[PDB]
């Protein structure tokens, strides 16, 4: 959880949908 940082391949805040590499969608 705990939102995200760029270290995780996500902007701050996380994009949400828009290319977010944190969920089963590949
Ligand atoms: Zn992330
Ligand atoms: Zn993310």
UniProtKB/Swiss-Prot annotation:
It comes from Triticum aestivum. This is EC protein I/II. Belongs to the metallothionein superfamily. Type 15 family. The lineage of its organism: Eukaryota, Viridiplantae, Streptophyta, Embryophyta, Tracheophyta. Induction: By abscisic acid (ABA). It comes from the Eukaryota. Binds 5 molecules of zinc. May have a role in Zn(2+) homeostasis during embryogenesis.
